[PDB]
Design a protein around this ligand. Structure first.
Ligand SMILES: C[C@@H]1CCCN1C(=O)c1cnn(C)c1C(=O)Nc1ccn2cc(-c3ccccc3)nc2c1
Ligand SMILES: [Mg+2]
Ligand SMILES: [Zn+2]
Length: 314
């Protein structure tokens, strides 16, 4: 066989939840294949088809500040770390599906929210009334899988192929943060009443949904310099959308108003308290080996509090 190998530092550090994939774009496909070979197996996919698939996915990500090819591989890496630290809990089809779902979960993102597409009256908002961009990301995934020489699932039966496409569809739709609030609430109740059952497919769907949120938000689980620099790319997109809201004659929400830049630290504190800490708290309850995501999130919360007290500059 031809096995994928990484340099010594990457080989060691890729196993850590807080790994950063680095600024060499040309290394990310190899990093992805490495993660697929270790989390799924060297026989899960034909290397030639997988490579052609990866390069077509890359081509259908846009040159936007945050929702770009680097984000796709970053979200895939967080999923790799979750799978490797919980390897007994997931099925053959789930391992095959979930790294692909993460790579594809923001395909053809233009850096605008579902709310902006609705206010703009974008054609996608007529096609998909809810989870507008996420239904688009899945449609883009299906289109690429149906290109000649791109069927990475060609050895699966019709029924197995249908199952893995349903895992991918639900996983991509789950990255609509609007759906996360309800999903986490249901999982919290199920855990605290002890009704959560990983043999129940509807329960597995919710757990995978929370894993997708955890992977999607994973900039808050990196080391502080990575977290802080990623926030700049996030606000670059938010503020561009705010500008476009102002052009439609609509007051943007505060996080999208570039004139509110000085309030970003308090905005981060609000986001960690309302979204991130609860997300990683619930995930650690269900999958205890994901504890390092919650620890890193709490560490970054303390950094933002330090910025607010003027002991740090942002
Ligand atoms: C769901 C979208 C899509 C792209 C990532 N998304 C995230 O939410 C996300 C993913 N990771 N991180 C780190 C964030 C994030 O910074 N969120 C937020 C959330 C709420 N805020 C309120 C303010 C703010 C308020 C007043 C004045 C200035 C700023 N600033 C924020 C940032
Ligand atoms: Mg998305
Ligand atoms: Zn995303």
């Amino acid at each position: 066989l031809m096995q994928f190998t990484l340099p010594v530092r990457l080989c060691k550090e890729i196993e850590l939840f807080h790994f950063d994939i680095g600024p060499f774009e040309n290394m990310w496909p190899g990093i992805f294949v490495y993660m697929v070979h270790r989390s799924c197996g060297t026989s899960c996919f034909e290397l030639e088809k997988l490579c052609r698939f990866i390069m077509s996915v890359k081509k259908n990500y846009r040159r936007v500040p945050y929702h770009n090819w680097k984000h796709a591989v970053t979200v895939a890496h967080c999923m790799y770390a979750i799978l490797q630290n919980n390897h007994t809990l997931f099925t053959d089809l789930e391992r095959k599906g979930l790294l692909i779902a993460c790579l594809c979960h923001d395909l053809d993102h233009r850096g605008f929210s579902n709310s902006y597409l609705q206010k703009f009256d974008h054609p996608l908002a007529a096609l998909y009334s809810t989870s507008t961009m996420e239904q688009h990301h899945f449609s883009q995934t299906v289109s690429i899988l149906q290109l000649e020489g791109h069927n990475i699932f060609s050895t699966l039966s019709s029924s197995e192929y249908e199952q893995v496409l349903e895992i991918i569809r639900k996983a991509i739709i789950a990255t609509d943060l609007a759906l996360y609030f309800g999903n986490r609430k249901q999982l919290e109740e199920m855990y605290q009443t002890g009704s959560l059952n990983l043999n129940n497919q509807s329960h597995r769907d919710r757990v995978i949904g929370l894993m997708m949120t955890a992977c999607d938000l994973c900039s808050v689980t990196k080391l502080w310099p990575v977290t802080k620099l990623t926030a700049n790319d996030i606000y670059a997109e938010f503020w561009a959308e705010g500008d476009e809201m102002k052009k439609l004659g609509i007051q943007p929400i505060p996080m999208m108003d570039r004139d509110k830049k000085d309030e970003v630290p308090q905005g981060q504190l609000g986001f960690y308290n309302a979204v991130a800490i609860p997300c990683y708290t619930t995930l650690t309850q269900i999958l205890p080996p994901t504890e390092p995501l919650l620890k890193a999130c709490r560490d970054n919360l303390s950094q933002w509090e330090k910025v607010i007290r003027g002991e740090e500059t942002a």
